[PDB]
Paper text:
DepB plays a critical role in this process by reducing 3-keto-DON, an intermediate in the epimerization process, to 3-epi-DON. DepBRleg from [name] is a member of the new aldo–keto reductase family, AKR18, and it has the unusual ability to utilize both NADH and NADPH as coenzymes, albeit with a 40-fold higher catalytic efficiency with NADPH compared to NADH. DepB belongs to the aldo–keto reductase (AKR) family of enzymes. Here we present the crystal structure of DepB from [name] (herein designated as DepBRleg).
Four protomers of DepBRleg are present in the asymmetric unit designated as chains A, B, C, and D. Overall, the three-dimensional structure of each protomer adopts the classic triose-phosphate isomerase (TIM) barrel fold (α/β)8, except that the presence of Pro-204 in the region that would otherwise form strand β7 disrupts the hydrogen bonding pattern leaving this region as an extended loop. Two auxiliary helices designated as H1 and H2 are found at the periphery of the barrel, while the N-terminal end of the barrel is capped by an N-terminal β-hairpin loop. A pair of protomers (A and C, B and D) associate together forming a dimer with an average interface area of 2362.9 Å2, stabilized by 24 hydrogen bonds and 13 salt bridges. Dimerization involves 3D domain swapping with the exchange of the α-helix of loop C which interacts with loop A on the associating protomer. These dimers interact around the crystallographic four-fold symmetry axis to form a D4 symmetric octamer, with key interactions mediated by the N-terminal β-hairpin, α3, α4, and the β4α4 loop. The absolute molecular weight of DepBRleg was determined experimentally by SEC-MALS to be 325.6 ± 12.1 kDa which is consistent with the 317.5 kDa predicted for a DepBRleg octamer. Although NADP+ was present at 400 µM during the crystallization of DepBRleg, there was no electron density corresponding to this coenzyme. Loop B in the apo-structures of DepBRleg and Polaromonas sp. AKR is disordered, but clear electron densities for this region were observed for the NADP+ binary complexes of the other structural homologs. A water molecule occupies the position equivalent to the carbonyl oxygen group of the substrate and forms hydrogen bonds (2.6–2.9 Å) to the side chains of both His-122 and Tyr-5349. Overall, DepBRleg’s substrate-binding pocket is slightly larger and more hydrophobic in comparison with the NADP+- cortisone bound complex of AKR6A2.
Author numbering:
A (entry chain C), C (entry chain C), E (entry chain C): -2 to 218, 246 to 342
B (entry chain A), D (entry chain A), F (entry chain A): -2 to 217, 242 to 342
The structure:
Amino acid sequence: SHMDYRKLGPSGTVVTAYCLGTMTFGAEADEAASHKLLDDYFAWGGNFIDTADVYSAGKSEEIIGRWLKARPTEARQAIVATKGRFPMGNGPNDIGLSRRHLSQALDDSLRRLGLEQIDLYQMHAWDALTPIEETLRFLDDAVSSGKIGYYGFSNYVGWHIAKASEIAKARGYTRPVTLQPQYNLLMRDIELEIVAACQDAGMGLLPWSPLGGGWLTGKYKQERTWAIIGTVEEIAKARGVSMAQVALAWTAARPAITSVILGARTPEQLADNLGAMKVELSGEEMARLNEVSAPQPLDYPYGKGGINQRHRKIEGGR
Amino acid sequence: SHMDYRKLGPSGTVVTAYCLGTMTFGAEADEAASHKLLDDYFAWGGNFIDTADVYSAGKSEEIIGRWLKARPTEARQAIVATKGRFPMGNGPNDIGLSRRHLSQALDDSLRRLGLEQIDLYQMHAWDALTPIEETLRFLDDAVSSGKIGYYGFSNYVGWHIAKASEIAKARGYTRPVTLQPQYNLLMRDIELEIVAACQDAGMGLLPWSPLGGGWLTGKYPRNAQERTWAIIGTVEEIAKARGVSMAQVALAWTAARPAITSVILGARTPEQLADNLGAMKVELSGEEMARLNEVSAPQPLDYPYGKGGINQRHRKIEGGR
Amino acid sequence: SHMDYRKLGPSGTVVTAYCLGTMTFGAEADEAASHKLLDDYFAWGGNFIDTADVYSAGKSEEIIGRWLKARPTEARQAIVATKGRFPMGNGPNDIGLSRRHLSQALDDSLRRLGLEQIDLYQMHAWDALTPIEETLRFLDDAVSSGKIGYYGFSNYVGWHIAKASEIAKARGYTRPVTLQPQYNLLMRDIELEIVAACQDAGMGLLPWSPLGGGWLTGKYKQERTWAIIGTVEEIAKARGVSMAQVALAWTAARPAITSVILGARTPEQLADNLGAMKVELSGEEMARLNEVSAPQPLDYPYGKGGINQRHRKIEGGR
Amino acid sequence: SHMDYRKLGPSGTVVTAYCLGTMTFGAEADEAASHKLLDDYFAWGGNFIDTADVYSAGKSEEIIGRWLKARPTEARQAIVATKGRFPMGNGPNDIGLSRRHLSQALDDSLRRLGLEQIDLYQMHAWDALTPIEETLRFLDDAVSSGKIGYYGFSNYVGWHIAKASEIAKARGYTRPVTLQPQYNLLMRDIELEIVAACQDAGMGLLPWSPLGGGWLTGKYPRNAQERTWAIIGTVEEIAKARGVSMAQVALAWTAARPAITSVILGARTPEQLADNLGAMKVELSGEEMARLNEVSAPQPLDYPYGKGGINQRHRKIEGGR
Amino acid sequence: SHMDYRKLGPSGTVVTAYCLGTMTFGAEADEAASHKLLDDYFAWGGNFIDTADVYSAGKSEEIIGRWLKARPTEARQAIVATKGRFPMGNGPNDIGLSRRHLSQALDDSLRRLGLEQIDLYQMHAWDALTPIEETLRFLDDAVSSGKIGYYGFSNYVGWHIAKASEIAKARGYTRPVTLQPQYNLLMRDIELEIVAACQDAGMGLLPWSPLGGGWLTGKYKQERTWAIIGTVEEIAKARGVSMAQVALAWTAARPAITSVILGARTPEQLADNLGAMKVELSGEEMARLNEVSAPQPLDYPYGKGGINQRHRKIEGGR
Amino acid sequence: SHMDYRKLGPSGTVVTAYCLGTMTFGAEADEAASHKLLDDYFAWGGNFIDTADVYSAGKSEEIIGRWLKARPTEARQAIVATKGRFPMGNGPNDIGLSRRHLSQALDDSLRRLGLEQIDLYQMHAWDALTPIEETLRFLDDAVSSGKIGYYGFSNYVGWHIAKASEIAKARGYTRPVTLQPQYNLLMRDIELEIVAACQDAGMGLLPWSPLGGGWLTGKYPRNAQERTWAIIGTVEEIAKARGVSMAQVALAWTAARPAITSVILGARTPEQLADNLGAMKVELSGEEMARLNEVSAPQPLDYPYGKGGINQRHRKIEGGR
């Protein structure tokens, strides 16, 4: 078990290639089950926890919050990432990236998580009603006061990434570190330009739902899908491992991947998913999955046509 | 009689809602042909000329320059826009958005056009081999020296636009004015996010190929083929309904889309130029515009650009999910 | 009752189109009456409260301060706006926008209001004795420490708005959000350029005294006035609603209006004023009120002459 | 013998308290007439010439330029100021404060005046179609290249002045020097806040039409008409009292108002130019100045510009309301 | 008694034209006597107190500190100014404007003065061993945290003033407000350029020792001196007031004077000194004192020669 | 043989420790006289020429320019410095540090000197009528266009130097290099604080009149008169002791003071120029330098510049008062 350690984007913080998602904490998995999953994850060696204030209306944060207090040794190794943006209630200002809400949402997450500082505070989604300048200034005030260590994004598009990244740079704020996109063999549309936007900013990716909610595990059950699902099945049975470990090993080796967020619900699935770190796909199989699941946009501007138009051969010429 | 004027993006320059493309000058249209087109365009009231150094290896610029020399009255109205980026020769540096190449490309464009200042200088496409900071500095140097008035982009994607825009602000440079994208009823993918990027930066659109190279006029993988014909059928159905050209319906739709500054026409004959310019007098009804919008709507995966990802990022002003 | 929600200027915070003014709290309406008015306003759905430290020498703030503590659920929805600038005593430094006074005035309002942070802190009037740079730096320190969320202005003129707005922009401070002008059908002189100055800055308007202190309600009782009052009366009786609801519906639909500050004193007047949100004037009546109450300045520079001189026809020519 | 010199706003340039307006050159006054006026003005000791590209479609500038060519000694003393903004032609871009138009307007002004540097280049009026950032950048480019020395505004209101001023500071550009407003005993509305905006920015005033186009000299809704005549009656009463022209009283009052850099005279004959310049030797008494100030005081609504709004914003240095 | 109120330099804070110096508190005047003087000064209407941490090794601050706590009403009107720079002990770092010492000295003054914030914190003297950038950054951190309201200088020369003023401007810090120079009819050398340097920066002057330690009161007892002393005596007896009130009235009317720091030790002298505010010298007497006490430097560069060389006649010419 | 070279303040330009002043060229010394002096100076190895537009109404510059034209070899070594500020004419703007006047003063200096770039352009004196920001911007414009290399001041006091210096840093302009003060054994008041201001800004001193206009060589209120003669007596006593000129002792002292970049000689004849340049080979002893320093020490009041105010601001590195 030689750990797969990666940098939290451009920062000096290190995380394990696999991250524990707590979306099920307090929903399909109660406090007891959730406590078990955290114990197993850290027993394996992972140090990355991702939650959100809206995950069961704070029950997820509250569960994590007291597991951290009950096991202090692992608490001092864990990188905690939560989010804020979506409705913590039905009030007009119980929502968004406004200074008004983020102020209350950050204090609420800190409270329910039981921490003096949150390692990674992620905007759960773009908020067109709030100028990005306002959101960034609040985050910068939180960095200086110490409430947060770093910040990242989720549900941001290409020009979202670049605009925020460049404004923070111009205003002397800290650089953003990550983006949390829904990503897997059935959803690769972020590759059209969103990935490139992160790479330009030196940001890392925290892909969530690497199993497509279970569609890539094989259990489930419309043309492309089954061609893709069938490929994962042909390789897993060829290599003698689960479908999940295939799709997971594929996600882990994609460009700009900082850590994969697992959403496993049971100890068995967590032990199976984590076992993918020792699965080394072949370049021939990796190319096979890359092809059968390659996004097929229009030629312009993200398709083959627009890419060749923008390409510049170093030797010159058409 | 009633001309549709629009601001050149965020600047104080005004251009007619239709722009004369010159891709054919020196190729399919010789000097006399090109000069007749220019004459007809300015007799219509237009004031916007778009060319590029690579159109027929600089002959488009040379033809336009001789015409300007020969028409002092129109030349005083003309807003002249050209481009640089693609190869003017087979050398490793006859190309790119580098300081080395643009200084020579801009100078050659000025000489071929016979101008001391180009109104709108456009990067023909992104160049991942040149830092955007290097390109922007050069352009800022060209503004202060008076060689160019404004600058814009073509073949830039979402983060390209926001990055260059925000860096210009940070450096104190002038803001870019326009994006010249390939955009028509058959190709609306710049709406996934690129248009919004332009709107955030205050830039206007200079769409080109508004007729899909004759496909939206009449010259007759599964999902794409079906949409093309559903579009072609709607256009001619609305065209026959209103008793106008199919090209005029397509152009009226394009000129009515969000953020459109001027539609670049690619007419090769006086006859089709007149017809296309007649699109300005065609006011599509509410139902017609909606019918064309729905039948030609892009259909990406739900995440991130599809309906799902959109509703996720949306924030109701009243609150609640 | 479909709420009329608007943005607090350029910010990400949302407020109801109508705002409760507490000028009478502790004056014509004691703590009991004032408590009643707050209960009704929030029962209707409003979330915007405007007070000031000098409103009865803090009695207004103190009343609001304990209504907030007594009804915690509404307290967590309310956007609180107070002011500072005018004399809280007769000392030479018990007044102004100086760092010396604002420091004490902000802590005093926070104390009497019982809040950790004030949502909107408004300068009650321009202070020529204090450089705007000093005032803005203090406000920026308050934003960073969290004592305030946003800030706005009151009794500022056109070049006041632009100077402060542009200095904050150049110095990296947060942008101002609002202006609180005395505005109504009998006082539209802010339209000469003050409104345009706010629109250029993306700032919203919090008009107070939309009834002219009661002159537009019809009760009261010199040429223009009665022509204007008569117009409001001809429309209200034509539509079958009160004079107040007419003038209020007019104020709500004027350019750059974020929220109208009601100064009602009794439950009846508050219920009548708030009923104007469902009153949709006609374009013909809206034009009728716009004309009979149009400000008539000299031709130059704010009159018709100066406006046509500065106009630029997009097609060119004289 | 004793000349009244004043700084050109905040700059280190000095100009006489009276400036020769040239609106009539090439219209009511032909070349010879204009040249006599210029001669008489500089023989008086003046050094300030104000014109504009739009005065008689550039002929005012051409007349002034030929005169400067013909009077090398005076030309070395002349501070030359002109303008751009209003249409020099019927094209959509023969107008505005855009980079596109000002680059051509400034060049044409330099050519018509026969100068390599214009001392004071003025925006004739606000242009809501052009970002003030775009205009200010162009002007800053003109300062570094030496085409202009200073810049100023005309027909700007309160927030216009403060915005452009503060943005110049933020960008590191040179500060604007002057505002040229229409200002006289009959029109004092720039005192509602515009004057204060100018004082905050350190700018001086170049009032024009100081005689109300002959109304303040003698050429014979309710509240306005009454004030006009109460003013006209006071002027001639003080004029007959001191035994001087009505024009001289009006001018002496104007030149004594706050922030006044130089009063732009609009004289058409040598006789009336001499009389107007004689206003410099007229020192109105304390009572006379107060009587003129009160009878011509603006009277807006109490809020925001009236007495009420003023007392509200006032802060007693001792404290208390 | 119409108060002579002036602005604390460029700031929005106002102070009385006369300021109480506490140099004798704890030295020639014990805690009792010092308490009396503070009571009289505020009874007259003054609001300005100047002390220093080294005034009797903190005894001065400690005396003021508990008079403020014992009379809370005057405490809420008083503008408190203290200093730091000189040795609070014999340690190598018990001295200077270094971040190391000022940190401890500011906390010590706050402690002994019993205040949450000091209104005017003045550098007691230039410190060539500490870069002015270091001193200014510390002060700016103190402004933001609220420990101080404003800052000023003492024993700074012309290029000291300009360098600090312009660096703070360039770095976005707050502008300095005052300079505390030893100034009077026998010491006017700051007029050579130091005054002009303050005026360029919009800074006000807090002259201390306006009586020359008692030489201008007449009690004391070498050519210029007695000519100057004799002039003050000829005018005082001509006007029927004390010598002190003459010299004080002269100091109060000099260019750029914000407030005069009185160093009176007894109630009688304080009542006599303060009585000078109602003494209005004549322009003929003011010119008489200005001439007989005019500094006589060399022609170059501060003398008449250097001034005429640098002069520019607005009409041009030599 | 052994030349004393020193940096031109903080810059990378090198100048000989003695600089040829040209105040007399075109006045007491005609063209031939001036040309002989220049020849002798450069034959000695000097490379530093200081003039000013006001020296004989531009004739000093014209004489120097003709000489440079006639001596290509020396002209390639010459560091040429001139000035602008004082009146070149009786007009209200033939003077000052304004953009209006300096643009014309710098151009006229370049023309009279026959140069495309002046090495060191100096403000002859402070100008309280022109914002220092306006002057500094103009100078920065002249650096980028190549008209001047470096800039410096003359007749600036303590806060003048620190203010302009710090504003240049803030604006990103080039740093000023030198101050040219009147400084000699008889006039040391720039030591009260001005020298320290220069040292803080890294500027060097270009003292002029190092002989007190002949008083420190021999041409024969209470406290001042006494010091002058105590100084004159010490100089000739050290001069007779070492068997050298009185002028050489005075110059050796001046060139040995702190922050001295180059001493500007004001010689009118070849004989006295040779003698003065011989001061470079005179190395005053420790005792001699101390004796001259003490007898010529300034004596202001104790506060702020006297001994008292100095000891007050001093900080012992060990601590304690």
